[PDB]
Design a protein around this nucleic acid. Structure first.
Ligand SMILES: [Mg+2]
Ligand SMILES: [Mg+2]
Ligand SMILES: [Mg+2]
Ligand SMILES: [Mg+2]
Ligand SMILES: [Mg+2]
Ligand SMILES: [Mg+2]
Ligand SMILES: [Mg+2]
Ligand SMILES: [Mg+2]
Ligand SMILES: [Mg+2]
Ligand SMILES: [Mg+2]
Ligand SMILES: [Mg+2]
Ligand SMILES: [Zn+2]
Lengths: 97, 217, 87, 25, 121, 206, 81, 129, 96
RNA sequence: CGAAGAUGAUCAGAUACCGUCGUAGUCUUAACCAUAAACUAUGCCGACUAGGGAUCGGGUGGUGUUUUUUUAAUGACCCACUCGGCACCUUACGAGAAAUCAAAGUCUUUGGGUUCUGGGGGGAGUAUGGUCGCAAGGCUGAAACUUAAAGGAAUUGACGGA
């Protein structure tokens, strides 16, 4: 039976968007379905800031950041515990926590 | 002599409410079954189906026993209630209890020229429980109960003498068929015929008028 | 209903909803009957003497039995300027 | 028997049955 | 490991309900008068009942304990609750009324004092 | 039916216009635009307090029509009405329920909170919904202190009042007990104020 | 609302409807007696006028067509109907 | 599209009779709508209905009081003889003692009981009870 | 309008559509194609005499387990080969 | 990048996953094909029935911000409406077997108009015949025979290298 109203994706009015590649296993997956997380890490680690801080010219310099949009497939985002299958009443929630 | 709780039942053991038609008129929830025993003493019960439903456990099968029981006097009141119990004593005896609390009247009528003593119903009414749909149709005299013997017994105990039956869905599902029949005989009073178009004084309940020999502090 | 020889035979005339004219029937346990006491000079109870309305379960459950009673009590005089006909 | 995989078995037999009539003609 | 069963806590709560102007914050007299006012089949059972009941009173002397009702707190708790403030709330200190609040009072036709202040948007 | 003396006295309006009872919600339910008067900037909706009184007098006419005064059950789960419901309960007959309602009260005749009111008054139809829903099973009319954003399903009588402040809730409960006692043999004259002050219905901290 | 008066609705509740969905549909547009700054002569311009209307003297524009009402030419006095 | 405006009249009535309304609005006001509404009026099923003469085709506001359970169209307008009115009314109407099946007839748009008295017949429009 | 055309002049489109969808029944497709006489060894009849060739013992289907004691019969009227059950306790000794 | 194919490991076996290559293909031009879980498994048109807020595009009105610099264009934003759309949320009057659905409602109280399709499961989208295509195949499309269940939705358990 129809498990989700929005079937697995975000497509009510297209028929077709474009596919994207899963960054784990290179599965071709539609972009509206895929699963998207934004990873904004600091460049080094939080643990290694003070070592790079003392051993640097340019005091309080920038500590830059690494941004990358990650598209997963459903098989790879479940296995990497990103979406973590919910209950029948819970899965209707559309807020991040 | 049963210590009535529930104010309406306190008036009924008193003798202040003599008719169940006054309960029906103000739509009062009968929660105590001795209200029905005293007001409708000539009441007969027929136990029909004792089907055992079963529940799967880690091991074994626990076969509880359902019951459908129709109570009714053949002057225009029946009830119907389902009792799934561990034993068929508690299925039958408490099934008669739940049958009595649901007792509702039927608006008998005429196919008819209006020569005396209503023999039939006054309206084609339907009732839908599950896939089952039951239509009851007014019928001329001597028609008998043209119904399946499940729906025939519910209408015999409601005192209908002449009625036609359409059916749909799984009438072999016995619970839904009588439940859909019960909605059909229940909607006989819900149907606004032209002789009910007269504006009525909208009276005062016994629980307002007799508010001191009820509500025993 | 009556038979041929007079004899109003019914077994019971049901009440009506005062707002939507439906039959209030023996299982409508969402249906109410409100008694509103008439009031004598300078504001007492007149015990026993009511301005009585009945609402079926449908007009309540639709959320309209508020404004049903607003209209039903305004024309009886009980309310003065709460309900306006031209909505 | 996935019905798609029964199909490509059948489409194989669709060719062979119209081969054996062209064989005899 | 010292959580008490419902049969200790019901019987303790049933003692507080009908024997508050009796047994006090001492365990030893609570132990001894549960011999007369209750029929308890064991000495070990009686002492657990008498001890939680003793624990209950020590809680009652600082505030009521929910799940327990008797009159000795009931006419106490209303006597805290009859207090009226003489701060004259719902009396005018000097009545803040907006423009579309002044239009309402005018359209009721009544006599009120107001103070007209615009709303910042 | 109400001669001239049941008009909103301007001394009652100083109570209602200073307890912030006129400030309604930001979202008006379609069953409540009767009660709305001329929306203010920053979305403030002004309830007509004249229509508040006439519903309140009508409510008291319903309350002073049940011959036992005790089976007028009054409900308040929210704390802002919790003092006010008990002060309503002491002055009139008025079997109170303050705080949690314990479902199975109107039905479920074997319970220890088993009641059969002939009338229920609630403070918020949102929070007291278990009382309002269970009133729909045993034919009980419901009066309700309603804001403009509140569900009117199975609410027969709706007193349009602000439910955000504490003074607005407490005032309406005070005047509701008042007109019941005024419209029977308990507070005989209609023209003097009650010496029972409005602020004994009001919530306090701590 | 279960009882209302569709025959005589509120006139504010009539201006808050589409020009078709009212009780008697009709135009919400109008005509304007427009004067140029150059002279005194009188033209009649529709609301949603779809046309760069030119007068006798200032024969360039008096209103510019837009997607709705025509915007008048910023020096021209108008008067309704 | 809009083929039978009688259905556009008689579905706006049932949809608001069911929801307890004391009024409907009917668009677009045929004569057949009016002379259906007049038969429903004269037998006790609606109240006053008022026709709004706009300059196109008419709106109609009907005051529905409370007495109506079902009104509807039998589409297409079947040729009804005089010996099948007792088969047409026996299928649409709940009991014999009340309810009316509305015919079209060259003697006029009319219900079935007096069409049996007038000994006339014709096409069928619908029913009311 | 629930599928079908309702109109007065649409009696043909309903009648064509009925015959079209009438073929999906089991008896109408059998009776109108005449498979009783063409196929079906008893060519539309109820009883047919035949000549006994053989006595077969057919295994009964699982979960039953018995030998069913039929015979093999060539029909006199048609020459077709059929298997015929011999129903009672015994009675295979009665045939030949 | 990669049907095929070559090759490297493991597995008891691998004519498979995985690693490295790699023809056809993937791109295009000019012609064929005509199928997709071609899906919203929901024909198209029309009417009515219930509240909400957000967005898109269009329009109307603010002596509203924005350029607060004397009686401060235009865009953008804010607020209220209505027109149309993609959706959604809440309830469930109704509907259904339920999952759910303001449509899948206005349906035994069965008739707004109209097109196509289905008739227990297989055999079988098979045979044959016609037709279309360079072909792969497409469209139309059986019967004999066999079968007492197949299936749908939800419940409880059980089990999951969840
Ligand atoms: Mg699944
Ligand atoms: Mg697609
Ligand atoms: Mg068709
Ligand atoms: Mg390609
Ligand atoms: Mg296809
Ligand atoms: Mg399809
Ligand atoms: Mg299509
Ligand atoms: Mg829209
Ligand atoms: Mg088949
Ligand atoms: Mg085909
Ligand atoms: Mg072929
Ligand atoms: Zn000029």
């Amino acid at each position: 039976p129809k498990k989700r109203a929005s079937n697995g994706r975000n497509k009510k009015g297209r028929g077709h968007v474009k596919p994207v590649r899963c960054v784990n296993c290179s599965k071709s997956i539609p972009k509206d379905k895929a699963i998207k997380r934004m990873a904004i890490r600091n460049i080094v680690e939080a643990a290694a800031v003070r070592d790079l801080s003392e051993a640097s010219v340019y005091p309080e310099y920038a500590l830059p950041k690494t941004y990358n949009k990650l598209h997963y497939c459903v098989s790879c985002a479940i296995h990497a515990r990103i979406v973590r299958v919910r209950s029948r009443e819970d899965r209707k929630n559309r807020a991040p926590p | 002599g049963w210590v009535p709780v529930t104010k309406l039942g306190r008036l009924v053991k008193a003798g202040k409410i003599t008719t169940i038609e006054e309960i029906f008129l103000h739509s009062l929830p009968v929660k105590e079954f001795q209200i029905i025993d005293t007001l409708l003493p000539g009441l007969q019960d027929e136990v029909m189906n004792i089907k055992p439903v079963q529940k799967q456990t880690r091991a074994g099968q626990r076969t509880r026993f359902k019951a459908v029981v129709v109570v009714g006097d053949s002057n225009g009141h029946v009830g119907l209630g389902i009792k799934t119990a561990k034993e068929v004593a508690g299925a039958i005896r408490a099934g008669i209890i739940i049958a009595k609390l649901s007792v509702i009247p039927i608006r008998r009528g005429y196919w008819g020229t209006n020569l005396g003593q209503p023999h039939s119903l006054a309206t084609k009414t339907t009732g839908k429980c599950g896939s089952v749909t039951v239509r009851l149709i007014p019928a001329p005299r001597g028609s008998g109960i043209v119904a399946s013997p499940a729906v025939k017994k519910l209408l015999q105990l409601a005192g209908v003498e002449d009625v036609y039956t359409q059916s749909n869905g799984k009438t072999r599902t016995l619970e839904n068929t009588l439940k859909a029949a019960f909605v059909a005989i229940g909607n006989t009073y819900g149907f606004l015929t032209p002789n009910l178009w007269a504006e009525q004084p909208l009276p005062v309940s016994p629980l307002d008028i007799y508010s001191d020999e009820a509500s025993a502090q | 209903m009556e038979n041929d020889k007079g004899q109003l035979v019914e077994l019971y005339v049901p009440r009506k909803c005062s707002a939507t004219n439906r039959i209030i029937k023996a299982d409508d346990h969402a249906s109410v009957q409100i008694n509103v006491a008439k009031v004598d000079e300078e504001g007492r109870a007149i015990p026993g003497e009511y301005v009585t309305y009945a609402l079926s379960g449908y007009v309540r459950s639709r959320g309209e039995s508020d404004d049903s009673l607003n209209r039903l009590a305004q024309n009886d005089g009980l309310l003065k300027n709460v309900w306006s006909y031209s909505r | 028997m996935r019905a798609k995989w029964r199909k490509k078995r059948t489409r194989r037999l669709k060719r062979k049955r119209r081969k054996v009539r062209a064989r005899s003609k | 490991g010292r959580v008490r069963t419902k049969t200790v806590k019901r019987a303790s709560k049933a003692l507080i309900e009908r024997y508050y102007p009796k047994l006090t914050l001492d365990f030893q007299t609570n132990k001894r008068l549960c011999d007369e006012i209750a029929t308890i089949q064991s000495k070990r059972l009686r002492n657990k009942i008498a001890g939680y009941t003793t624990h209950l009173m020590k809680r009652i002397q600082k505030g009521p304990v929910r799940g327990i009702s008797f009159k000795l707190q009931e006419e106490e708790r209303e006597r805290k609750d009859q207090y009226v403030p003489e701060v004259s709330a719902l009396d005018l200190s000097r009545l803040n009324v907006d423009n579309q609040t002044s239009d309402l009072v005018k359209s009721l036709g009544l006599k009120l004092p107001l103070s007209v202040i615009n709303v910042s948007a | 039916s109400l001669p001239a003396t049941f008009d909103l006295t301007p001394e009652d309006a100083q109570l209602l216009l200073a307890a912030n009872t006129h400030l309604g919600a930001r979202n008006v339910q379609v069953h409540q635009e009767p009660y709305v008067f001329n929306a203010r900037p920053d979305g403030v909706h002004v309830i007509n307090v004249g229509k508040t009184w006439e519903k309140l007098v009508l409510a008291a006419r319903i309350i002073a029509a049940i011959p036992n005064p005790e089976d007028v059950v009054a409900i308040s789960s929210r704390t802002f009405g919790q003092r006010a419901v008990l002060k309503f309960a002491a002055h009139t007959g008025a079997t109170p329920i303050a705080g949690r309602f314990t479902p199975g009260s109107f039905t479920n005749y074997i319970t220890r909170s088993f009641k059969e009111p002939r009338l229920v008054i609630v403070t918020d139809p949102r929070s007291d919904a278990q009382a309002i829903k269970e009133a729909s099973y045993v034919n009980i009319p419901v009066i309700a202190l309603t804001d403009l954003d509140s569900p009117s399903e199975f609410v027969d009588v709706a007193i349009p009042c602000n439910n955000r402040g504490k003074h607005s809730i407490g005032l309406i409960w005070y005047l509701l007990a008042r007109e019941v006692l005024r419209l029977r043999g308990a507070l005989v004259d209609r023209t003097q104020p009650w010496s029972i002050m409005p602020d004994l219905y009001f919530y306090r901290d701590p | 609302v279960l009882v209302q008066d569709l025959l005589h609705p509120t006139a504010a509740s009539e201006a808050r409807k589409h020009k078709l969905k009212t009780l008697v549909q009709g135009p919400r547009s109008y005509f304007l007696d427009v004067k140029c700054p150059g002279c005194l002569n009188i033209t009649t311009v529709f609301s949603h006028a779809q046309t760069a209307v030119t007068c006798e003297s200032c024969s360039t524009i008096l209103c510019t067509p837009t997607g709705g009402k025509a915007k008048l030419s910023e020096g021209t006095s108008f008067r309704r109907k | 599209t809009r083929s039978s405006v009688l259905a556009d009249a008689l579905n706006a009535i049932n949809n608001a009779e069911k929801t307890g309304k004391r009024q409907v609005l009917i668009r677009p006001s045929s004569k057949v709508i009016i002379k259906f509404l007049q038969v429903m009026q004269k037998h006790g099923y609606i109240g006053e209905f008022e026709y709004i003469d706009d300059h196109r085709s008419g709106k109609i506001v009907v005051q529905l009081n409370g007495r109506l359970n079902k009104c509807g169209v039998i589409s297409p307008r079947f040729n009804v003889k005089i010996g099948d009115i007792e088969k047409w009314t026996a299928n649409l109407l709940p009991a014999r003692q009340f309810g009316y099946v509305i015919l079209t007839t060259s003697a006029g748009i009319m219900d079935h009981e007096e069409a049996r008295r007038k000994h006339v017949s014709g096409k069928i429009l619908g029913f009311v009870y | 309008g629930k599928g079908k055309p309702r109109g007065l002049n649409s009696a043909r489109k309903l009648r064509v559509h009925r015959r079209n969808n009438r073929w999906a029944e089991n008896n109408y497709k059998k009776r109108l194609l005449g498979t009783a006489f063409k196929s079906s060894p008893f060519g539309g009849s109820s009883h047919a005499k035949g000549i006994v060739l053989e006595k077969l013992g057919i295994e009964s289907k699982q979960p039953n387990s018995a030998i069913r004691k039929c015979v093999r019969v060539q029909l006199i009227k048609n020459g077709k080969k059929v298997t015929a059950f011999v129903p009672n306790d015994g009675c295979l000794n009665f045939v030949d």
